[PDB]
Amino acid sequence: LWAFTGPGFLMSIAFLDPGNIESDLQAGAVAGFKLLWVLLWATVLGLLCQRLAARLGVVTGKDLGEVCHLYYPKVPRTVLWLTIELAIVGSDMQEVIGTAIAFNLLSAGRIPLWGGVLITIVDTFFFLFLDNYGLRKLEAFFGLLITIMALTFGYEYVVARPEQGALLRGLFLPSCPGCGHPELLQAVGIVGAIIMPHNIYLHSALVKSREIDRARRADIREANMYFLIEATIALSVSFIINLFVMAVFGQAFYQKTNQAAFNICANSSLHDYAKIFPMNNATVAVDIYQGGVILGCLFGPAALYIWAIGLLAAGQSSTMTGTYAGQFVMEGFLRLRWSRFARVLLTRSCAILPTVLVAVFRDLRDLSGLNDLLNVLQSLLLPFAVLPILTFTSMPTLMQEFANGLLNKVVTSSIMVLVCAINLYFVVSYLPSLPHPAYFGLAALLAAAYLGLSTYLVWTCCLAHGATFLAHSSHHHFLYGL
Ligand SMILES: [Mn+2]
């Protein structure tokens, strides 16, 4: 019967991390049905990236990790693995921040911000205690949880009655009406959170698991096509869900004042989450807790709880996704297979200490600013995963027949230059807030190292495709290949 009735949705329900909810709600509060075009373009852009990743994993037979280990010296291998691990621990930081904010939400502030931290450590204990074939059952249960929250949440979206013309125009037309610095920050966070560096690696690794006959190129072609349909189904589902979430939050939060929210929640059933808001009539600083509060205010008392459990399930799925990706990237780059327990413990700890410090000495708004900064960090770390994949899918020696057509190379050059332009704009927008002489120091040195690794990657990819009539004799193994 249907050979696609079930496959495809699984990858999406793992593409929908809590970050695509938090950055979503920040963008929806900062602007209405405006940044949706950024969402659509990012979804298409990640569709292209996942197509490239599946291509590489299918035809080559290796993953990004194995090819990177094979085709790099020790220093760039190590620094690239460090950046990938930084991306994974940043995703885990976003997950723990979301879970902690949700847990602070549940008890009406009785549990402290590090109470959520302790429950995440309990979750890691649960993972290590299970570590069995029944883990897939728990993953299915949590996937059903996020699925049901998404379904009831789409019901709430259609209840919200979004103005059709406004969000249709915002989606199909890329205008930026009255945009400024915070909306720039939210757009960059969206483009860096909808798609993430470690998804490409993990997708390639999972693609490698599929056995390929290799006798004829036909089986490779059909496998690549089927995986492309899988990826496009997942991306379309993710984009639809994020469109629903962005539209509803922008409808409920665009030109919303503290007095307005207090007045609506004073008229509703809910009370403690009615009195949370202050009385200032100014613009509202918006985080996950207030988003859940207004959700429960408008769409019913159970909305708070369902949003909370959905966020928790998304965080758990993202945690499993991250530990899988981390195990694969270490096994590839550094050629060591650690148990899943080692990965989850390492990533969870390396995420938990900074979040513990910030939560214990700062407030909720600082947490939201911090995890927005993690989304932007994922944006800045995108190139370190988007150049190697193009380098290895355009390389004539691992794959001869299924190389890259000139249209694909030029559009990938466009992706790289565009992402570089957005990152450069963000850096020039954010750096001026360092008003101390000689303070540039370590941060500037790290930025210089970032640019040096970027230049190294640019040189490598230029060797991969071009280098004709202009190349250096040293490090000539790239063009010939191994
Ligand atoms: Mn995402």
UniProtKB/Swiss-Prot annotation:
Catalysed reactions, as listed in the record:
Zn(2+)(in) + H(+)(out) = Zn(2+)(out) + H(+)(in); Fe(2+)(in) + H(+)(out) = Fe(2+)(out) + H(+)(in); Mn(2+)(in) + H(+)(out) = Mn(2+)(out) + H(+)(in)
Q: Where in the cell is it found?
A: Late endosome membrane; Lysosome membrane
User: Which domain of life does this protein belong to?
Assistant: Eukaryota
**Keyword Glycoprotein among UniProt keywords:** yes
Annotated GO biological processes are: antigen processing and presentation of peptide antigen; antimicrobial humoral response; cadmium ion transmembrane transport; cell redox homeostasis; cellular detoxification of cadmium ion; defense response to bacterium; defense response to Gram-negative bacterium; defense response to protozoan
Residue ranges annotated as transmembrane are 2-19, 29-48, 86-106, 111-130, 140-160, 184-202, 231-250, 293-312, 344-361, 373-393, 410-431, 440-459
Cellular component, GO annotation: endosome membrane; ficolin-1-rich granule membrane; late endosome; late endosome membrane; lysosomal membrane; lysosome; phagocytic vesicle membrane; plasma membrane
**How does this protein sit in the membrane?**
Multi-pass membrane protein
Please provide, alphabetically and separated by semicolons, the GO molecular function terms listed in this UniProt record.
cadmium ion transmembrane transporter activity; iron ion transmembrane transporter activity; manganese ion transmembrane transporter activity; metal cation:proton antiporter activity; protein homodimerization activity; transition metal ion transmembrane transporter activity
Q: Which UniProt keywords apply?
A: Endosome, Glycoprotein, Ion transport, Iron, Iron transport, Lysosome, Membrane, Transmembrane, Transmembrane helix, Transport
Q: State the tissue distribution.
A: Macrophages; peripheral blood leukocytes, lung, spleen and liver.
**Xref: InterPro entries:** NRAMP_fam
Q: Which residues lie on this side of the membrane: Extracellular?
A: 20-28, 107-110, 161-183, 251-292, 362-372, 432-439
Q: What does this protein do?
A: Macrophage-specific antiporter that fluxes metal ions in either direction against a proton gradient. Localized to late endosomal lysosomal membranes, delivers bivalent cations from the cytosol into these acidic compartments where they may directly affect antimicrobial activity. Involved in iron metabolism and host natural resistance to infection with intracellular parasites.
Q: Which family does it belong to?
A: Belongs to the NRAMP family.
Q: What is this protein called?
A: Natural resistance-associated macrophage protein 1
Q: Supply the source organism's classification.
A: Eukaryota, Metazoa, Chordata, Craniata, Vertebrata
What's the gene? SLC11A1
